Amino acid sequence: GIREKIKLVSSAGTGHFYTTTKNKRTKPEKLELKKFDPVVRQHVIYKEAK
């Protein structure tokens, strides 16, 4: 149980987030993926947050 829970917050400016887990020890660099944003209906960048 070392994979803490993180949410990838959309960079489109809306408050939308996917939620996932991450090994905060072996992967200190913040996650960054291009996922779909149903609010704007465009694949945009999601960046890790708390």
């Binding site: 829970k5 939620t19 996932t20 887990t21």
Partner: protein, 64 residues
């Protein structure tokens, strides 16, 4: 006297047009990162109470 409706039941079931009861699917309150979006999407709509459990519901909701 009048029958007291079970108040907790009245907060979770609503009678439909033909007499059936609609309810809200369980398992969608928390611990939602584990669950796949396919599962969570299917639990979002309201469901109809099953045949076996209709009798228990109607007793708890005699006025509706």
């Amino acid at each position: 006297p009048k029958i007291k409706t079970v108040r907790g039941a009245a907060k979770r079931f609503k009678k439909t047009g033909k007499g059936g009861f609609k309810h809200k699917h369980a398992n969608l309150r928390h611990i939602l990162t584990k669950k796949a979006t396919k599962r969570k999407r299917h639990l979002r709509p309201k469901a109809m109470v099953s045949k076996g459990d209709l009798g228990l519901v109607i007793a708890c909701l005699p006025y509706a």
